[PDB]
Amino acid sequence: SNAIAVGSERSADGKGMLLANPHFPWNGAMRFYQMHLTIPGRLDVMGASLPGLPVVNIGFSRHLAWTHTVDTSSHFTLYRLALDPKDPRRYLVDGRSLPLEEKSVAIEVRGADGKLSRVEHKVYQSIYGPLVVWPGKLDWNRSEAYALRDANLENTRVLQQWYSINQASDVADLRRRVEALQGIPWVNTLAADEQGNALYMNQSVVPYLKPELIPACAIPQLVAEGLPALQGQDSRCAWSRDPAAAQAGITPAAQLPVLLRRDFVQNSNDSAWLTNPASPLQGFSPLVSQEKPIGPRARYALSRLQGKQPLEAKTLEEMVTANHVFSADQVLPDLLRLCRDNQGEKSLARACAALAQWDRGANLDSGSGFVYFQRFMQRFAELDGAWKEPFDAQRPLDTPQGIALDRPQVATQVRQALADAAAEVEKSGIPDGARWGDLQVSTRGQERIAIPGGDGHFGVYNAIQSVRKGDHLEVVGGTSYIQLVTFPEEGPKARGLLAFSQSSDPRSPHYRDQTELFSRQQWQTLPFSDRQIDADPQLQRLSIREAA
């Protein structure tokens, strides 16, 4: 997901502005749906929601717009159990042997013959939560096992939290409502209001350990691999209690990152750290936010946002619709120099020519250079010490950069990587001259629709993930509900699209209509006022009722 909120010090109109670009599946239980909800006098909100939820999850109201992005905080911890050496179904806490609980579930299974059979299955549980096995990493042997405590299992506040967000008036009110209930499970919140405040909150449900416990309780090797793993044989490693937290054992709201600005805040799924580099967010629990190198989408966004020039709605829209492959900025200039140094290598000629021609984008008409670049990058990623300028913590916006071509080993390996990628691409059965939109599509009945964008890991802000399906790349997730909101005097002006269209049913008139628009990158008005709704010549009305 991406989000950008702009305030009064940087917007062209001196008021707030918000770009919401969540990247979520195109099918299933996380498929967004647009709707506008009104209880006259006290609720009037529009945006998009997830299946089955009677609340707006990303949206806007008269003076406020908000969105979310998946955060980097941990929302569970693993506990390494010390098993009782006499019995692997018992584990030790403070030296005392405790039995696992066994909860059995019964499932009905339809067989080859069409009959049902009953399958029973035992779920083992510790005082922390159920046991989990990852063969070869988190095993259950005679010495140890692993249990998992999920902080959102006791978060009964999640629907209430978006009901409350849906009632918020402005950014101060949104912040009070979220800090008060702490019902957000696993996203950041970014918002702007008409008055020109830009807000970032990393306010979600996060296991709490007091600072002195963190180094004491960690399993060092697993934490080094990114797993929030704790010593489960020591009762002192229970999540910490603080009366200010809304739920036992979660982090109180005052200890979670918040930034309130009048220039901008942004996030593309990195930590809170460089939300706005003019005011770095540091000094939080590592369960909450760490200072890690930011990914290419955020580096892209900050490259467009930093500086003194006013930001227009069009500027934010075009950050999405440009489909710029920002990772190419870091590697393509030195890669092309390597191509020029090897004009005699016949095996490289077609890739070098494609890469040279390429518009450095993931547009429908972008040439095969994009595909060569992706396959090259997948190999470049595996090389060691190949960056000319490695990540520098004092230059987090501009590193890593460049290929270290002056090191003879690197030149050799990078050239091999390109030859490998070139052979891989050419071994695929892709028609000569095919462009990116010929390859990447979304199927609708037995038509396809060409879909622009590309993988967020290559720094394409319009992130689209696809999978090979027969002769094509079928879109499975990415840019989904798009909303760009500004606050002119008459009322909120919201523009965008639901990329995969309102309905998942091929019979519906709304199965592919916005997908055609998304293909052409033609965003539309999101009508909110009674005036905007009535001006629609497609307006249909129905009133329904029944007894309770």
Partner 1 sequence: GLAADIRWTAYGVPHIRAKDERGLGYGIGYAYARDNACLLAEEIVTARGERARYFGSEGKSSAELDNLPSDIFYAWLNQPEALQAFWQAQTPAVRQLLEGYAAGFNRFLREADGKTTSCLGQPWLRAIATDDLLRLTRRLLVEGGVGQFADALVAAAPPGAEK
Residues identified as active-site: 1
If DSSP codes are grouped into helix, strand and coil, which group holds residue 508?
Answer: coil
The answer to the question of residue 85 lying near partner 1 (CB under 8 A) is no
Q: Report 477-506 residues binding partner 1 (CB under 8 A).
A: 498, 501-506
Q: Can residue 307 be called a binding residue for partner 1 (CB under 8 A)?
A: no
Q: Angle, nearest 10°, between helix axes 349-357 and 327-340?
A: 130
The answer to whether 226 contacts partner 1 (rule: CB under 8 A) is no
Q: Is 140 in the site for partner 1 (CB under 8 A)?
A: yes
The only residue of 142, 210, 241, 531 in contact with partner 1, by rule CB under 8 A: 142
Based on CB atoms, which residue is closest to partner 1, 136 or 429? Answer: 136
Alpha-carbon distance of 89 to 76, in angstroms, equals 23
Cβ atoms of residues 244 and 253 within 8 Å:
yes
Instruction: Rule CB under 8 A: say whether 82 interacts with partner 1.
Output: no
Instruction: Please tell me whether residue 129 binds partner 1 under the rule CB under 8 A.
Output: yes
Which one, 45 or 441, has the nearer CB to partner 1? 45
- Whether the ω angle into residue 400 lies within 30 degrees of 0, i.e. cis, is yes
Residue with smaller CB distance to partner 1, 145 or 190:
145
- Is 73 or 323 the residue whose CB approaches partner 1 more closely? 73
**Strand 472-479 relative to strand 440-444: parallel, antiparallel, unpaired?**
parallel
411-447 as b/e, with b when 16 or more CB fall inside 10 Å? bebbbebbbebbeebeeeeeeeeebbbbbbbbeeeee
31 binds partner 1 (CB under 8 A): yes
For strand 229-231 and strand 76-84, is the pairing parallel, antiparallel, or unpaired?
parallel
Does residue 224 touch partner 1 according to CB under 8 A? Answer: no
Q: How far is the CB of 177 from partner 1 (least distance, A)?
A: 14
Identify which of 171, 187, 176 has the alpha carbon closest to the alpha carbon of residue 2. 187
Q: How far is the CB of 121 from partner 1 (least distance, A)?
A: 5
Q: How many residues bind partner 1 (CB under 8 A)?
A: 96
Interface with partner 1 in residues 144-183 (CB under 8 A): 145, 148, 150-153, 155-156, 158-160, 163
| Strand partners of residue 4 | 19, 266
Helix ranges (H only) for 143-217 are 158-166, 171-181, 213-217
Closest separation between CB of residue 135 and partner 1, Å? 8
Q: How far apart are CA 497 and CA 535, in angstroms?
A: 19
Site for partner 1 in 359-378 (CB under 8 A): none
Contact window for partner 1 (CB under 8 A) among 58-66, 230-238, 455-463, 510-518: 510-518
Q: Please tell me whether residue 113 binds partner 1 under the rule CB under 8 A.
A: no
Give me the least distance between CB of 206 and partner 1, in Å please: 10
222: contact with partner 1 by CB under 8 A: no
25 or 491, CB closer to partner 1? 25
Residue matched to tokens 């992130």 = 463
Question: What does the per-residue mask of binding to partner 1 show for 62-81, with x meaning CB under 8 A?
Answer: --------x----xx-----
- Shortest distance (Å) from residue 99 CB to partner 1: 12
User: Cβ of residue 287: shortest distance to partner 1, in angstroms?
Assistant: 13
446 scored as a contact of partner 1 (CB under 8 A): no
Give the residue, chosen from 5, 6, 18, 55, that forms a contact with partner 1 under the rule CB under 8 A: 55
Q: Which of 94, 108, 406, 447 binds partner 1 (CB under 8 A)?
A: 108
Q: How would DSSP label each residue in 268-291?
A: SSS-STTSSTTS------TTT---
**Which residues, other chains included, contact 47 with Cβ-Cβ below 8 Å and sequence gap of 6+?**
34, 35, 56, 57, 58, 59, 60, 481, 483
Task: List 105's β-bridge partners, or say none.
Answer: 121
According to CB under 8 A, which one of 132, 216, 224, 278 is a site residue for partner 1? 132
**Dist CA 182 CA 172 (whole Å):** 15
* Among 9, 12, 13, 35, contact with partner 1 (rule: CB under 8 A): 35
Q: Any long-range contacts for 335-341 (C-beta under 8 Å, 24+ apart)? A: 335/376, 335/403, 335/414, 335/418, 337/405, 338/403, 338/405, 338/411, 338/414, 338/415, 338/418, 339/418
277 sits near partner 1 (criterion: CB under 8 A): no
Q: Which two tokens stand for residue 202?
A: 């990393």
Helix (H) / strand (E) containing 45: strand 43-49
Q: Which of 134, 216, 279, 520 is close enough to bind partner 1 by CB under 8 A? A: 134
Using CB under 8 A, pick the residue from 277, 280, 293, 527 that binds partner 1.
527
- Please report whether residue 443 would count as binding partner 1 according to CB under 8 A: no
Interactions with partner 1, residue window 368-427 (CB under 8 A)? none
Q: Does residue 30 belong to the site contacting partner 1 (CB under 8 A)?
A: yes
Alpha carbon distances (Å) from 77 to 91, 161, 214:
17, 23, 12
Q: Give the one residue of 2, 34, 330, 374 binding partner 1; rule: CB under 8 A.
A: 34
Which of residues 152 and 366 has its CB atom nearest to partner 1 in the complex? 152
